[PDB]
Amino acid sequence: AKAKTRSSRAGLQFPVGRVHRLLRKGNYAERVGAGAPVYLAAVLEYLTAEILELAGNAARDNKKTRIIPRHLQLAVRNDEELNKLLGRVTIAQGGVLPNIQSVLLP
Amino acid sequence: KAKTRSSRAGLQFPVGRVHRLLRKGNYAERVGAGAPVYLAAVLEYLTAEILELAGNAARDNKKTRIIPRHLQLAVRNDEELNKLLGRVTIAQGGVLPNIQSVLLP
Amino acid sequence: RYRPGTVALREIRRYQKSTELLIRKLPFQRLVREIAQDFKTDLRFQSSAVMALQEASEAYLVALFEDTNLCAIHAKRVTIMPKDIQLARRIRG
Amino acid sequence: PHRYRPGTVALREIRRYQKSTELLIRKLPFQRLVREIAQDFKTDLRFQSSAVMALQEASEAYLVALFEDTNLCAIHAKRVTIMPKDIQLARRIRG
Amino acid sequence: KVLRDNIQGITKPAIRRLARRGGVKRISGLIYEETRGVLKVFLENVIRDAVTYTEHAKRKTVTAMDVVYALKRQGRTLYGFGG
Amino acid sequence: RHRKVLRDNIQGITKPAIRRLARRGGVKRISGLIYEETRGVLKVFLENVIRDAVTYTEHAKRKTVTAMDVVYALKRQGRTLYGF
Amino acid sequence: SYAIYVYKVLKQVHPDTGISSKAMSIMNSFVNDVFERIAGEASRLAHYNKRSTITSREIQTAVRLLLPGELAKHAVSEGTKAVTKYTSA
Amino acid sequence: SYAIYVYKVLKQVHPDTGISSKAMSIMNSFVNDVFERIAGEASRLAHYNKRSTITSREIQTAVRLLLPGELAKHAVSEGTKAVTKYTSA
DNA sequence: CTGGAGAATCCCGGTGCCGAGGCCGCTCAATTGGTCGTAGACAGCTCTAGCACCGCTTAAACGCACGTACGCGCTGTCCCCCGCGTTTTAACCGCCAAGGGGATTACTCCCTAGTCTCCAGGCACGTGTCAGATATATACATCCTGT
DNA sequence: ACAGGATGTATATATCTGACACGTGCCTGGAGACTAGGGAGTAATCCCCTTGGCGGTTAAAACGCGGGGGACAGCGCGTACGTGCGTTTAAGCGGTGCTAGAGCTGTCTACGACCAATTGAGCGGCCTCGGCACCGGGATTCTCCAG
C-alpha cells in the first residue's frame, strides 16, 4: 500500500521522524505522546520560520542573496522575545548589535 | 543474614535510595556499579563537611540543636562550597554577618 | 531615643542576626489570591505555600539588594537608586 | 603629519569591527598559549588550528560581551573609562 | 468578593527591614515603589509559572512543592519546604 | 631552530589588539591596568573551561581536542556557541 | 544537520535567497540546543506532576512556560491547528 | 527526608547534637538538588561522549566538573575507599 | 558651530574563482500495521484542611513633627593613554614533506538491567520530657550627651 | 575627640510547656543471586591533517614623539528620609463550624514501545558557474583643521 509522510499530514517540511527519534533517544520520559513530535516540531518550525524570514530580509538589506551569520545576529537580537529566549548564547562570526550609549555618541 | 550496600561499603548514606532515584530518574540506559557507591561517598563527604561547620556554628550559639541558620552559615562560610552554591536560597537561614568595609564606621 | 542612623545599623545587626520572616501572612496571602484570580476558577491555596512564597520573596529581595548594594558601593555612593536594580535586571536577564 | 582626532579612531573601529567579525588576537601566539597551558595535562597533545580559531571566537566574543557589561557598569558609574574593579564586579555577579 | 490594595501588603517598613537584612544603609523614597514594581513583575512571573504548572496538572490547589518547582524553573531553588 | 619553548605567550594578546577587541565591544577609553588584567581574567576563564575540556579529553583518552570538546565544555558553564 | 530543511523553509519564504555554510551550522546548533532545552523542561514537567509520558499537554505547558507572549500563543495556534489537521489527516 | 541518615552521620560528627525538622528538610532538598545536578551532568557526559552507560568513571568526571579542587580530590579518596571495601565485600 | 578639504568606504564599472548549489548514486530513517502491557482519565466517596465566621488587644502598619545628612554638579589637576609612522620578525602566506593518532572494523569480554523473594531497616504515628519558650532581673556593649 | 550614663541586648537564673526524641506496629524497599542480553573496551589497521620543515612578503608588534582628556577629589548647595511616639487598623489571638475537594480506590479504555518489513526521502560525494572577492576609480560619506 502507498504511504504519505507524517510530516505532510501537517503540511510541514521538518522531520517529525528525526525530532521524534531524538526525543525518544534523549532520555526525557518513559513514553512519548503522539502530539509531542507534531506539536513540538510545529512550534520549533514556526519559530524557525520567524528567524529564517528575518535573516532573509536582513540579508536582502545589503542586496546580497546569501545569508551570513551577521544577519542572524541582527535578526535574532532585535526581537525582544527571542533575545530573552537566547540571551546567554553567542553567535559565532556574527558579532553584536550596534548599541552605543547616548552619552558615548559624539 | 543480608546487609545494606552502604555498610558493606562502610557507608551510612543509602546506596539503595540514590541508586533508586538514578534508575527511575531517566538519565541513562544503564548506570555503572561504581556510580552509586561513588556518588554516595561524595554525598557523605559533603555532609560531613557541612555538619562539622554547622556543629561549630551551633557551638558558637551555645546550642545542641541544629536550626536552618546553622546550615546557612555552614554553606555560605565555606568559600568553595559557598561560591559553588552562591545562587541557592535557604528558608529561615538569614545571611552571613557581612557588612562592606566602607559601611562600617 | 536615637539620633539618625543608629537604629538602621541595629536593624542590620538584629535582622542579619535573626532569621524570621518580616511580612504579615494574611495581606501577602490576599495578594497571592488576588493576582491568582485571573487564570483558573475555584483555586485553593496552602498556607505553607504562602509561607514558601514569603520566604522566597523576602530572601530574594535580601540577596538581590545585596548585589544592588555591591553596585551602589561600587559606584562610590551610600544610597541605592533604581538604576542599580535596573542593572541587576539586565545582568540577570 | 596627518592625525585623526582623539576618539574618532575608536568609533571608526567600533562601527567597522561591528560590521566585520574577524578575530583580533594574533593567531599563532594565542594558539601557542593554548598549547603551552595545555602541556601540563597530557603527553603529546596536538591541536587543530581551526579548533583554536573557534576557541578564539568564543574567547574573544566572551571578552566582548563581558566588556559590554563592564562598560554599562562604568557608564552606570557615570564614567567612560572602564577599570579592572568593574570587571571584578562583573565576575563577582556572574560567579 | 473583589480584593483591592494588596500592593500595600508588601509594606514599606517590611521593605526597610529586608533592606537592612540586605545590607542597605540609606533608602530613597523611589526605592519602595521601584521595589513594588520590579518585585511585583518578578513575583507575577514566578507565581504565574506556578499557576501554569497547576493548570497543567488539572488541580485546583497550589501546593508549596509547586512553589518550589516554580523557583527551580528560574534557577532560584529554595530549601525548607519539601523535596 | 625557531622552537617555541613555552614562555610569555600570554603576552601574545597585545595592547592594540586588546584596544581593537574593546572597540568591537564598544569600549571607548581604556586604562593601562585593563590590558594585563584582561590577560589574567582571560587566562583564568580559559583555564577553567579548557580544563574541563581536557577532562572530557582524558575520558576519551585522546591527544587531539576536537571542536565538540569545546562545545561541551562551554555548555558545562552554560556558554553554548552556535556554528560548531 | 537540518540543512535541507532550512533550505525547504528558506525557499518557501524566500525562493531566491541562499545561506552561508557557517550560518547553516549556526542554525543546526540552534535547533539542537533549543531542542535539548525544551525537551529537558518537558522532562522536569513530567517529574513535577509524576507523569511518565510527554504528550501535547507537556509540550503546550512547556511552550507556555518557556516562550513569551505572541510567539507562544500563536505557536499554540499553529501547533494545535496542526494537531487538529493530524486528527483529520 | 534524609532524617535518619543525616542523623547517623550527625551522630558520627557530633554525638550530643540534635537538629530541627525544617533544617532536615533543607538537607533533603540540598542532597536531592546536588544529586540532580550530578545526575544531569553525568547524563550529558555519557551522551555527549556517545556512551549509554554512566559509571564511576563518568561520575568521576562529573565530580571533577562540579566539585572544585581538593573537595573533588577527597571525593576521589572517599570513592576510592568506598569502592575498595565494596569490591572486597 | 558651521564648513570646505581630504580620506575610507560604498558604489559604480570590470575581472575570475570556487564554494554553493545543483546532480547523481546510496542507503536508512521514516512509515504502516500490528501486538502487548500498562499509564492515566474517570467513577465513587471521603476526611484533611480549606472556606467561612466572631470578638477584643495590640502588633503592626501609618501618620505627623523634627532634624540631619545625602547625591551630584562644577571647576580644577594631572597623568597616561591615544595617535601615528617606522622598524622589525616571525606572523602570514605560499609550499614541501612524515607519520601521529583519529577513526574504523573486528572480537570478545564483561557489565548492568531486570525479577522475585525476603525481611529488617525504616516508615507513620503515638507519647513524655527537657530544650527552649518564657519570665525576670541585670551586667555588659554602645551611643550619646555633655566635657 | 573623651567617657560614663542609659538603654538595648545578651546574660543569669528559674519555671513551664510542647516539639523533639524515642518507643511501638507494621511493611516495602533494598539486597542476593542468577539470568540475559549487549555496551564498550581493545588490537591493529588506514590515512587526514597536523606537524615539521623552507622561503618570500609584509602584517603587525614595538617603539618613539607629541599632547588631549578622563578618573578623581574637594566643596558647597539643597534636598528628603529616618526616628520617635501616638493613633488606628485589622491581623493576631484563639476559637468556631461543616464539609469541599484532595486524595484514595476501583474501574475501563487507549497508546506507545517495539519489531519487522518497506521505501522513497535524505545523505555524501562530485561537478558546474555566477555571487562575490577583488580591482580601480568616482560618488558618497565621514572626519577634520579654520572663520
Residue numbers in the entry:
A (entry chain G): 12 to 117
B (entry chain C): 13 to 117
C (entry chain E): 40 to 132
D (entry chain A): 38 to 132
E (entry chain F): 20 to 102
F (entry chain B): 17 to 100
G (entry chain H), H (entry chain D): 33 to 121
The authors write:
The nucleosome structure is stabilized by electrostatic interactions between the phosphate backbone of the DNA and positively charged residues on histones. Nucleosomes are highly dynamic and can move along the DNA in an uncatalyzed or chromatin remodeling enzyme-driven way. Our structures show conformational changes in the histone octamer that are required for DNA translocation and thermally driven nucleosome sliding.
The Class 3 cryo-EM map is resolved to 4.8 Å, with the resolution of the histone core between 4.5 Å and 5.0 Å, and the DNA 5.0–5.5 Å. On side B of the Class 3 structure, the H3 α1 helix moved back for 3 Å and reverted to a similar position that it occupied in the X-ray structures, whereas the DNA moved forward for 5 Å, indicating a movement of ~ 1 bp. The H4 α1 helix also moved back in the Class 3 structure and detached from the DNA at SHL 1.5. The contacts of H4 with SHL 1.5 are lost and primary contact is now formed with the DNA at SHL 0.5.
